[PDB]
Amino acid sequence: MDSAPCMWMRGGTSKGGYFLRADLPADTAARDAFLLAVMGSPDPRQIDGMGGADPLTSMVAVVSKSERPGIDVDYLFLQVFVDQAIVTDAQNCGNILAGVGPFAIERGLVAASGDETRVAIFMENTGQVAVATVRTPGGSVTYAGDAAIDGVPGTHAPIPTEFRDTAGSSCGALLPSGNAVDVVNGLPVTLIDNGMPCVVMKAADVGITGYEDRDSLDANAELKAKIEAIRLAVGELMNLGDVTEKSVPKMMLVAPPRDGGAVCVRSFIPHRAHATIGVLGAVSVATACLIPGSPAAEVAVVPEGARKTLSIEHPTGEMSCVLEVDDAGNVVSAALLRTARKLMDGVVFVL
């Protein structure tokens, strides 16, 4: 097959191609080779495909109607590497998730149910369910509205998303090492998975402030080398095997908030600096803020009460994470606002 139907969408602060599962090769080696060609990878410019030469604009959602009881659609996230011939399936992606609901409704996978449509989305990569609510005025998806998210110009229709049962969905526990803190290459880190495996550490401990812009961080070869050494050192401890060629864990460098939020973060995902912050990445970081003795807890400003709005500051503003904690202080849910937009709909081609 040399082409496939495809909707190009912005999902949250990321961008990529949304496919029906049936339209892609069933064999995953052939599927991944096709997706590389669709995107134009490997190429630092992605000039001969639809990737935008940024991992955050080189992403794929494979969506299908679900047979799981109570679930509307199944969603597989695939990261297409920009300049390697690698497609990875080892993580969730809550930004690209934002486009899944609207894509599924437009494609008839799930019926609109009034002016707003709840969509229960099984995230195949980790086996957990997320719930998105999509504006469907008059029974049709809209992308217009009054909502805004930092990192995206303008305003769009809101897409509230809610995540439960996130802890340990990749590493088998919230803290796969069993410790709140671990010393790695002479630095305290928290190894944490509440929907995204993360290594959380103080920006100041790897020799930056945590307030640098994306270009400054991407050009900092010395910083990138130092944190890559830590990432490779903890891959097995987080039950992720050999992470050398994986996209996980995400490296989260935290600092005290500056614009009135809970914490400030710079993320490497795992090699490129994030332009903003990942959705489940932010949930893991926000969760670490609540763990006494974590580097995150030391720099964070944490509100009182069972339902905590934790503003996570990032290079171009912030993204707020509403957590509720149970009896024992465990996070039992996380809710975040996203938006999406259909950008182009048609057929993608490969040679």
Add this chain to the structure above:
Amino acid sequence: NMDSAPCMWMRGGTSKGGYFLRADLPADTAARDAFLLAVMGSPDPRQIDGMGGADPLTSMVAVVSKSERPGIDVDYLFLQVFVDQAIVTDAQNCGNILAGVGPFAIERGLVAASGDETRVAIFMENTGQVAVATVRTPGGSVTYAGDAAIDGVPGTHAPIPTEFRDTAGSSCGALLPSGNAVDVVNGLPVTLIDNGMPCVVMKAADVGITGYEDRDSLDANAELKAKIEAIRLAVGELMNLGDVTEKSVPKMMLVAPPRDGGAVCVRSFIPHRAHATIGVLGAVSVATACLIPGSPAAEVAVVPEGARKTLSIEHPTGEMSCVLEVDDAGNVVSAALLRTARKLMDGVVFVL
């Protein structure tokens, strides 16, 4: 306000952008620009809410229509959509995006396939110049598959040879709008030249680089970029380009001796980002400058002898050759260059 249009996303040469039928876009320029900005996701350094790839070279538009001009198959207007300003500019040719125009026009039925290699004569509306491209149409259908390669694009595709005649002065009114082979601007000798793309040609070494740096190093060189932009703003009137402050011309061309067997090595700012490779008509202008005695380009170039000259223009990821025919007076009378293209996505683009 228009909220969708049919659109083919293509790679044209080493560039990428949206190809539209003229009839599918707003007739009013202001409405058209607001639509195209929104299609691309501009202004936004990351172009996250549209189809632009956060680089001027992947934020380009071609507007194509069947031509009524005798002997011309299609009319093609090139539009640059700025990445992080609300500006769409029509002031230049674009010979990379031109490569997609032939195949696009045949797919869209604007020109019929003719044999297995279809000639397509293309009127470049921005300057009134014509290019002639040949498109592989085996069995009557465009193919993008083939054995040709161009530096800056992985793999191989169908060849699209292109030939340009009557190139000189199409934006500035003359090949050398100042009348001089060299002018001194901000302390350094430059050549102001237009052989299809208005350019300021200067020695890389005179502005503090070697000319062999990679694109990332050049885009990070704020001191260099400020020096170059001050020169650009100082030459707009001399080049008969009026007020260039919000324009994308002239292109700033920094030349050095060839290092990999070519005629000259170039780095180009277009005008603000460093080029990842080199523009097609920009290269023609630089190649032409190499032939002018006294030019900075002639001082660093290695120029082959003969009436037919293959001038290899070296750039950050290899080279692109310009085959120039020159007449007895030494004037360039045609330029021929190989490009390729590929259809990437076809369908409908949307805006709010």
